[PDB]
Symmetry: C2
Subunit: 104 residues, 2 copies
């Protein structure tokens, strides 16, 4: 329906070499993409506190909220894009990205 959210779920394990300062700057830059990418409306992230899957090693979760029925290609080609961009794609040891519309 109109105004339904399209969400991207970014699931991350950082490489051991990545510093706490670097991680902080990474998330700061990602949240600021809301002001740069028109269709991007919100970014929220956090650190897993449970560690229920330590063998899979993922530690961080980032939720990106986009407007539906709008192009997001400017995000895809953005230098800061976590998977595709030159700036940060070397930061992660492991990375999953999902694309879903939340419903109930």
């Amino acid at each position: 329906g109109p105004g339904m959210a399209v969400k991207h779920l970014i699931v991350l394990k950082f490489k051991d070499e990545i510093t706490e300062a670097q991680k902080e700057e990474f998330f700061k830059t990602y949240v600021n993409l809301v002001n740069i990418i028109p269709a991007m409306k919100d970014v929220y992230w956090g650190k897993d506190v449970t560690q229920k899957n330590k063998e899979e090693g993922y530690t961080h979760i980032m939720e990106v909220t986009f407007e539906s029925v709008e192009t997001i290609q400017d995000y895809i080609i953005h230098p800061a894009h976590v998977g595709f961009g030159d700036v940060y794609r070397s930061f992660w040891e492991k990375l999953l990205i999902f694309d879903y519309t939340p419903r109930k």
Copy 2:
């Protein structure tokens, strides 16, 4: 507020109707388990993930990490896991506080 996040891959044998049954039953848990706040789920549309990766996301909101645990040990959630764990091949759980 905190989030209990589930990343899920169903067993190969599970049908579309069974996936819908799973989510309907899970969402109804909010009518039963006091600790729970709102639940949303979605299906991943990424073609790359579909072949052998996780396929579904469930987000559950809670007041605190403590009330997440209240939900974990509730008889209704125990009962759900007892009869629907068979539906999933693998999953990931994350408990975290969203921030910006």
